[PDB]
Every structure is written in C-alpha cells, then in structure tokens.
Design a protein around this nucleic acid. Sequence first.
DNA 1: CGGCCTACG
DNA 2: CGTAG
DNA 3: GCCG
Length: 325
Amino acid sequence: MPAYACQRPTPLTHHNTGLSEALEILAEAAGFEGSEGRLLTFCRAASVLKALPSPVTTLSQLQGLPHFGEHSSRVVQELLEHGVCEEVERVRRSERYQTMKLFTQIFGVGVKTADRWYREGLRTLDDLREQPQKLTQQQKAGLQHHQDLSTPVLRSDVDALQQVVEEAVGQALPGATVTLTGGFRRGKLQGHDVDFLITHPKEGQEAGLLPRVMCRLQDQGLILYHQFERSFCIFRLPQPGSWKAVRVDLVVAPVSQFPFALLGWTGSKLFQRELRRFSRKEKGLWLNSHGLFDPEQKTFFQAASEEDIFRHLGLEYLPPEQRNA
DNA sequence: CGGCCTACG
DNA sequence: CGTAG
DNA sequence: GCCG
Ligand SMILES: [Mn+2]
Ligand SMILES: [Mn+2]
Ligand SMILES: [Mn+2]
Ligand SMILES: [Mn+2]
Ligand SMILES: [Mn+2]
Ligand SMILES: [Mn+2]
Ligand SMILES: [Mn+2]
Ligand SMILES: [Mn+2]
Ligand SMILES: [Mn+2]
Ligand code: NA
C-alpha cells in the first residue's frame, strides 16, 4: 500500500465503508476543533481502507498500512470486536459536533464562523435567521436556499444544467467548451453541486468570458445568487411545474492551463491535496490548478492532457473514477 | 520538531 | 474569512 | 495523528 493517495487507485465502490465512515467522523470532529493535522491523518487512514481489495475482518490486516497508528488502529479494533467505537459514538451524539455539522454545511459558513456562533449560544438555523445582520450576503443566500441545497443533485439535474450552461457559453463565445468536472466526472451518481470547466481552443479568447456567461444566465432568470475566473453560483433550476435551487461552480481557464484545471477540479479533494504534497515533497515541483512549476529552472511544464501531468510527476496514470480518495 | 495543498472571491 | 477540488 |  503506497503512502500517498495519488499513488493508488481508489474506486467509488469499496469494501470498508463502516470503518472508513467512522474514521471520517473523527476527522470531521478534529476539523471542528481546529486540528487540521489530525483531520488529515484520519482522512488518510479512511482513504487507505477504501483502496483495499477486500473487507478488513481482523486487526492483523492493518499491520504495516500507512497512516495507521495507535489511535486509528484502536478505532478499527473496537468496531471489529464490538460493532461500535465509544469515541465515535460520543462525538456523534455531542451537541457540539451536531451543531458544528449543521452550521458548516451552510454555504458561506466555515469552521471559524460556526465555532463563534456556537460559543455565542446559537444552535439552530432558526437562531441564525433571527439575527440576519450577523450574516454576509453569501451566508444569507446559503440559508435562504438551505433546504434545496440539502437535496442530492442527480444526473438528470446535471444534464439539464450542462445544457443551459452550454447555451450561455455558446452565446458568449463561439467555439468555447464546457466540461463536467467534480464528483460527477469521477462517476458519482449524486452530489452537493455541479462543477463545470470552460475554455476555448484559442489561447486568450476566453478572457472576459465568465462575466458574459453570467450576464446571459441571469437574463434568462437562471441565477439566484452569484459573486473573475471562478463563480460559485446558486441556479434556479426548472423542474416540472416549479424549480429548485442548485449549487453550480463555473470556472474558466485558458487552454494552456486546461489539463491542470481539469485535474484539480476533478478531485477528489484528498486526492488533489495528496497529489500536490507528492509533487512538492517527492519531486520538488509546485502543482496547482494553473500549472506545474519547476522552481529551480523557473519554468512551467507544458501539458496537453492529465496523462502528461501524471507522467511528469512519475506517477501511474489514474482515470477519474479511480481518484475517489 | 514541525508539516500537513494551494489557489481565487 | 469564505469558496474550490 | 501520523511521519519525515
Ligand atoms: Mn473492489
Ligand atoms: Mn490518541
Ligand atoms: Mn473491547
Ligand atoms: Mn462538486
Ligand atoms: Mn463545487
Ligand atoms: Mn488565474
Ligand atoms: Mn509537534
Ligand atoms: Mn468538494
Ligand atoms: Mn499532534
Ligand atoms: Na460551509
């Protein structure tokens, strides 16, 4: 088992859901308490279990696995022996965990904001709504549309959204393209949002595109919230006789950067953090959604495909459906 | 000991 | 700070 | 929390 998540395939369907979900609770709780390092270890340990070929049945099967130490091993041991882990159950039932989960799921609210509200005694969405001057415009939109945004986005929604985005993009710039990214490109059947990457084959023609696309969508009445090259939107998606709010991310990249943007925006989140860590720590190259930089030569790697990027980092290529770390 | 991804809005 | 994967 |  390789130590970095970008070194191993991780399929969407795997064999250790119970164990990985428990470790991910502890990771989320670590985040709520402000420990990104513990969050990362628990995330990495959960991800190792997703890459295994079979269910873990006995603690022996963990020996030698990366990111399993005393704490993560004890969690698995309790789950294997007893079906539950006392620490996980205590976290699950705590008012702090439940409220932090409730607040951070709001679009516009992260851990630091949620933690302040918790310390101020707030506990419910109705508490937040009763104090609206304490909200940014982004948070007001997230709260306004919270019910819809909690409803899974389905493939039929993706297809309808891709059609309307393609229509606006084509009106704004002939020849521009729209690529579905995010979890749906990795094969997920559902999601919390839909992610799209927009480019044009002639370098530079995409300058100024995203404001033109947004203007065209807003004039068709499709935009409930927005506000460049990244737009984190809420769309008014038509449904039979009605509509529902859906989170949509729109990203524009020049074609020179498209493989890097496609790689970054396809995820998973852990896969990309691990890939960027690997690049810098193991290869001495700096990776982001714009490029891959050699800081000694002060040059950027020219990539035509995601495969090119994997090759330049010395990694076996993984298709999107194996990046579900 | 000290790192832990790296951007844009 | 929030967002993103 | 784990590891370089
Ligand atoms: Mn399998
Ligand atoms: Mn411990
Ligand atoms: Mn026991
Ligand atoms: Mn997404
Ligand atoms: Mn998104
Ligand atoms: Mn840019
Ligand atoms: Mn330390
Ligand atoms: Mn994400
Ligand atoms: Mn520690
Ligand atoms: Na949030």
